[PDB]
Design a protein around this ligand. Structure first.
Ligand SMILES: Nc1ncnc2c1ncn2[C@@H]1O[C@H](COP(=O)(O)OP(=O)(O)OP(=O)(O)O)[C@@H](O)[C@H]1O
Ligand SMILES: Nc1ncnc2c1ncn2[C@@H]1O[C@H](COP(=O)(O)OP(=O)(O)OP(=O)(O)O)[C@@H](O)[C@H]1O
Ligand SMILES: Nc1ncnc2c1ncn2[C@@H]1O[C@H](COP(=O)(O)OP(=O)(O)O)[C@@H](O)[C@H]1O
Ligand SMILES: [Mg+2]
Ligand SMILES: [Mg+2]
Ligand SMILES: [Mg+2]
Lengths: 113, 383, 438, 380
């Protein structure tokens, strides 16, 4: 029930996701392991036209998109915070919010150090 | 959250590759496992996101113009009205029950146009030019845009020829001109159409009498009326012989709202053929108070914000750009004319209504028809 | 089996959203919810995107959970049509609610059509005499035209439409259809028991000799049922017109409840409201329904519709839209009824396309325009007689007042359906007796 | 280049953070010890304010289902949405917080009906307020029942004597009728309605058992003192033995005044469905529509004429069609309605006034001019 305090208070609906992502990764001591996973998936959107199609195309169904991601994100050494966040954004079509969870995670991380 | 560090994030800062090296060889066998549900991606065609109440929101359609005819795969036509950043709002020219989510939308390339020419002279068409009289397609005709701008100051000349209507309450007290726009305004069942039908019937009596160039070619635009009233009116125009010079555009009450909105512009483009070729036209926009209700339905369903009586803000421009196309051209443009008789129905004599006060300020004259003078035996009930 | 079955996404009153995973139904298609307490039929109204349709329920939605299986029927609401519907009461979705067993259908027709085309319109202005003095003289009814009775909650639109059933439906040779849309269920049981003793509706083995089909979507029903039960009432009448070639009578007790029930669902369809609070699609919903009720080249529908004006406001947009869809309007007035004059028809507000000297003869036409002349002249004196009395008028205008005070009593008439609560017997007046009397 | 489409996001589900926080706190290795937000039959309040609570979860809730908050105040699941549940609250919303647990009771909104409701003063939800203990010989039935159809009814044949001379002679009222009492304020609206309830006490001691009339008096938006002065009248007369008293007063919440006619009709539909005869009186019918206008505008629904919703006709048409004279194969019982509508300056062309006139069978117009000229009851 008790979550750690974020180093700064931020905006709504994409900064409170990064605030919640920061409070959850601080309970796992997994901050810099989930920070570079954000920039890794950003490179994955720059490479593939089929992984940024799940973020932008409105005709990909909500059951296909959560079964592309969760069948791509089998264990593979990736964090369980990443494997449970990116399927929550895939279940609601919020994969395009990854580019602002990352920016608001950068400001939470430098305020932590 | 600023765009400086957000566009800095375009540069790579991953510092590890234990997902980029893993999922790149895992994504293409994962996409190919669900490709039965993938619809093919769309760029220059369209695909329907949502359809309802005669409005289709269309994904794609990258190179469509504003106000452009689009065509769904079920054959029904559309019109790209508001081009937004992620979709296109299309008003459907017909029944939207044949349109589904995921239907392909096809750009036709052309702005909305109707057949104009001598082949329309005698036909009953809908609000887009398709003949509904059951006499085959339109032959000896050509296509012209419905949104031609009005002739300017240097293109016009002063209104000097009479164009009598045959109603001596009109022709003595409120004299019409040859390029004049005269409003016929009144309550319901006060004789609005009667004054306009007697004008069309009187041109048939005058066209068999004048030398070939003072002849007046009528166009009746029936917006929002019921279909049996229109058939009751072609029967009158055929038994009189007035249908030889009359075109009838009829977007009835069962038609879609963008068909009744476009039928005054469809009929004016057919009547602009005679103005632009040295002949004389006479257009009657019967129930122009019903075009504004049809235009209000599209804009409220395109989620444009409402105004006075929930009408759009640009509902003055709906009727001002329509009626200003009725002009008397100069000698260097043929000398042809086009005179308009818009019809506005008031509610309990309230002249101060929103659409009523717009067309009063647009048109030259007014023909006020009062329901209390109508029952005193004064027919036509001219105030 | 998992495909062609959507699940309920969200429930906002009578409006239900259903998400179809595989394939979406068409707009106007009918659906069925599994496991409801009653037979809940949804009709698809909008494709909302993200594989969701937006539907309107035909019954109550209380008890709906957001996982309930919804099956697509692949077709719109199909109702039984034919001569087997004669003497039967159907609801909006074609179920028999008269406890007489199933309906022996000649066909199962969808309730959604296009209007008949321009080439299938008939121009035959023949009079239909009703036996009512204010109707036969000042606004005569067409034999195959649309007829409106405009009224203000207690002015007598239902007693007038029951007198028209009492007068012209017995003399008609064809089939009557009563579409009870949004009215009192007590009146639907009153009309059913009156049509059984009169032999218009026969029960049991003699059911084939019935001449009336009742369709009832009364005011205890949700707004989805009251918005489509007029379309069910046309479909029974459209079968007798098109297929059987009959002359149909269609009585629609309050067509305004079609417009009002479409405004109760339009608040939840996410539309921006139009003028006073009705839907933005007022003219095209009413125009889509009213254009199906026509006389075609293969059959005539003489439709008599009651129109409710909502707060005695004729400028309200739902009565004002209906005025353009009719051949003969009979505007009833609250102030005429307070004088005791029944039927409370306003003679200076009721019009007809038949009141033309080339249709009804110049002798009938000149009397009606003379009756309307002195009734308008009496209305022009109404404030001089109020603030100054009749002693200040001219001797040629006191003759105008006394004659117009006589004919507005002479437009009054006792009805054969009002004899139960007024005591006086009904009077059927012939057409030539009205022109000679006036 | 390829990231230009992601520089600002696009999503529905305004409560986006609630679904993510149900997927990230199980990713913590410590909070897999059944640290689970209950969402199937329970729910958390997201927003609350002016009588509407938005509730996350409740995935198994029915539409129209009576839910209960952890405070003890009950509600009704009105809007079932894709990510939340809109709940109208049947009490004061000041005892509901964000994060409060909402429990579903399992059933649609119901009131206790039966012979144990006679003699009891009741709020708009079923629980007694007279301080005489819980309802004992009673059972729960829905407040929202579809009215009986065409075959289920029969013609109104038997008279309901009001005890008023100007009513029983001039405006005669049968069993199963809906009769509007309409007039200005202080024109004798209740003077006519509560003479009918008192007269049923005098008639029930002389007619046989199956001919008695059991009354229900619904007080919508009244003063609580005038409700208390009316129970003293019904007790010192003896009319309370055959009378149920439902009261949602002016200080009660607007969903309680919306539902108190439907609660009192369901208590009156017990007698109709069992062959007995009922008499239901909705005092101040317009009031309920004002309380329903309050709920509709606070739900941000588009207002129509006089800022009323589009379904304000259906508010009263659904209620009053349940007053019917049933057929002989349904017991033959009846229910007689007396809705009361207060007009302003005698204007009966108002929206709610013309609504109920086009619902009920007759009207009792009580004129304000005859009432101050001593003619009482001032029947127009
Ligand atoms: N000069 C006239 N003499 C006699 N009757 C007339 C005359 N002008 C119109 N009428 C009659 O008045 C009625 C209404 O005329 P018209 O149809 O032109 O009215 P309107 O304002 O178009 O009505 P609506 O609102 O129904 O379209 C008709 O019955 C018509 O025949
Ligand atoms: N028949 C009668 N004879 C004498 N007084 C009467 C009669 N009927 C009613 N009154 C009195 O008239 C007054 C009006 O109160 P009542 O409750 O009957 O009116 P109301 O229309 O319900 O008013 P409100 O709008 O305040 O609820 C009371 O003082 C009541 O006692
Ligand atoms: N033809 C008539 N003769 C006598 N009284 C009538 C007549 N028509 C209506 N009324 C009176 O007006 C009332 C209107 O009843 P009804 O026609 O059912 O109302 P609505 O017009 O709202 O449907 C009747 O109860 C009666 O008192
Ligand atoms: Mg007209
Ligand atoms: Mg009625
Ligand atoms: Mg009172």
């Amino acid at each position: 029930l008790k979550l750690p305090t974020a180093p700064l208070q931020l905006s709504g609906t994409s900064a409170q996701i990064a605030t919640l992502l920061w409070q959850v990764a601080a309970k796992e001591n997994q901050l810099d392991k989930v920070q570079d996973e954000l920039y890794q998936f950003i490179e994955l959107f720059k490479q593939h036209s089929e992984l940024r199609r799940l973020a932008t195309d409105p005709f990909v169904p909500t059951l296909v998109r959560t079964k592309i991601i969760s069948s791509v994100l089998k264990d593979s050494g990736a964090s369980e915070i990443t494997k449970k966040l990116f399927e929550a954004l895939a279940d609601e079509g919020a994969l395009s919010a990854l580019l602002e969870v990352t920016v608001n995670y950068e400001e939470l991380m430098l305020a932590h150090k | 959250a600023d765009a400086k560090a957000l566009d800095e994030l375009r540069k790579p800062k991953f510092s590890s590759k234990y997902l980029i090296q893993h999922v790149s060889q895992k994504l293409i066998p994962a996409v190919k496992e669900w490709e039965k549900s993938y619809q093919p991606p769309v760029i220059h065609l369209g695909r329907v996101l949502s359809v309802g109440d005669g409005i289709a929101r269309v994904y794609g359609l990258k190179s469509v113009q504003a106000g452009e005819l689009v065509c769904f795969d079920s054959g029904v036509k559309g019109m790209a009205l508001n081009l937004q950043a992620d979709h296109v709002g299309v008003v459907v020219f017909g029944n939207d029950s044949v349109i589904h989510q995921g239907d392909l939308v096809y750009r036709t390339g052309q702005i909305v146009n109707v057949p104009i020419g001598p082949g329309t002279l005698g036909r009953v068409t809908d609000g887009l030019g398709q003949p509904i009289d059951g006499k085959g397609p339109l032959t000896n005709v050509r296509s012209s845009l419905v949104e031609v701008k009005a002739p300017g100051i240097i293109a016009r000349q002063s209104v000097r020829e009479p164009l009598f209507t045959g109603v001596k309450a009109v022709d003595a007290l409120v004299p019409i001109g040859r390029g004049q726009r005269e409003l016929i305004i009144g309550d319901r069942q006060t004789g609005k159409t009667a004054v306009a039908i007697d004008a069309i019937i009187h041109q048939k009596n005058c066209n068999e009498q004048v030398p070939k160039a003072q002849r007046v070619y009528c166009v009746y635009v029936a917006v929002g009326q019921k279909r049996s009233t229109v058939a009751q009116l072609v029967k009158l125009f055929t038994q009189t012989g007035a249908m030889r010079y009359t075109i009838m555009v009829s977007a009835t009450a069962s038609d879609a709202a963008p068909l009744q909105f476009l039928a005054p512009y469809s009929g004016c483009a057919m009547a602009e053929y005679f103005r632009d070729t040295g002949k004389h036209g006479l257009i009657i926009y019967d129930d122009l108070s019903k075009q504004s209700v049809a235009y209000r339905q599209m804009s409220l369903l395109l989620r444009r914000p409402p105004g006075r009586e929930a009408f759009p803000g640009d509902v003055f421009y709906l009727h001002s750009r329509l009626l200003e196309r009725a002009a008397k051209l100069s000698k260097e443009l043929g000398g042809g004319s086009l005179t308009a008789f818009p019809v506005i129905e008031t509610q309990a004599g309230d002249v101060s209504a929103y659409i009523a006060t717009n067309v009063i300020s647009i048109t030259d004259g007014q023909i006020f028809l009062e329901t209390e003078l109508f029952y005193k035996g004064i027919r036509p009930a001219l105030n | 089996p998992a495909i062609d079955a959507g699940y309920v996404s969200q429930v906002i009153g009578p409006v239900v959203d259903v998400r179809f995973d595989g394939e979406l139904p068409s707009i106007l298609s009918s659906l069925e919810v599994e496991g409801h307490s009653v037979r809940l039929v949804l009709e698809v109204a909008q494709h909302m995107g993200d594989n969701t349709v937006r539907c309107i329920a035909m019954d109550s939605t209380d008890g709906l959970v957001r996982g309930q299986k919804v099956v697509d029927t692949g077709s719109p609401i199909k109702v039984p049509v034919g001569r087997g519907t004669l003497g039967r009461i159907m609801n909006v979705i074609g179920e028999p609610v008269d406890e007489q067993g199933p309906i022996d259908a000649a066909d199962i027709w969808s309730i959604h059509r296009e209007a008949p085309e321009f080439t299938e319109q008939s121009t035959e202005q023949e009079i239909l005499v009703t036996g009512i003095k204010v109707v036969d003289l000042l606004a005569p009814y067409q034999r195959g035209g649309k007829i409106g009775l405009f009224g203000g909650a207690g002015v007598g639109k239902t007693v007038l439409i029951m007198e028209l059933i009492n007068n012209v439906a017995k003399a008609h040779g064809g089939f009557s259809v009563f579409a009870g849309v949004g009215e009192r269920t007590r009146e639907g049981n009153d009309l059913y028991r009156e049509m059984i003793e009169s032999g218009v509706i026969k029960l049991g083995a003699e059911r084939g000799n019935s001449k009336c089909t009742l369709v009832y979507g009364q005011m205890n029903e949700p707004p989805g049922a009251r918005a489509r039960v007029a379309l069910t009432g046309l479909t029974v009448a459209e079968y007798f017109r098109d297929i059987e070639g009959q002359d149909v009578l269609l009585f629609v007790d309050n067509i305004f409840r079609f417009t009002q029930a479409n405004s109760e669902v339009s608040a939840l369809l996410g539309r921006i409201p139009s003028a006073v609070g009705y839907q933005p699609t007022l003219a095209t919903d009413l125009g889509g329904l009213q254009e199906r009720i026509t006389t075609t080249t293969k059959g005539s529908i003489t439709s008599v519709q009651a129109v409710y004006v909502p707060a005695d406001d004729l400028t309200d947009p739902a009565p004002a839209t209906t005025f353009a869809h009719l051949d003969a309007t009979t505007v009833l007035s609250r102030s005429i009824a307070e004088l005791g004059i029944y039927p409370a028809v306003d003679p200076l507000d009721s019009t007809s396309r038949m009141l033309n000297p080339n249709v009804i003869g110049a002798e009938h036409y000149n009397v009606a325009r003379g009756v309307q002349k002195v009734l308008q002249d009496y209305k022009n004196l109404q404030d001089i007689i109020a603030i100054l009395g009749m002693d200040e008028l001219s001797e040629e205008d006191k003759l105008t007042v006394a004659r117009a005070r006589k004919i507005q009593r002479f437009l009054s008439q006792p009805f054969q359906v009002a004899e139960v609560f007024t005591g006086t017997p009904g009077k059927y007046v012939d057409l030539a007796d009205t022109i000679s009397g006036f």
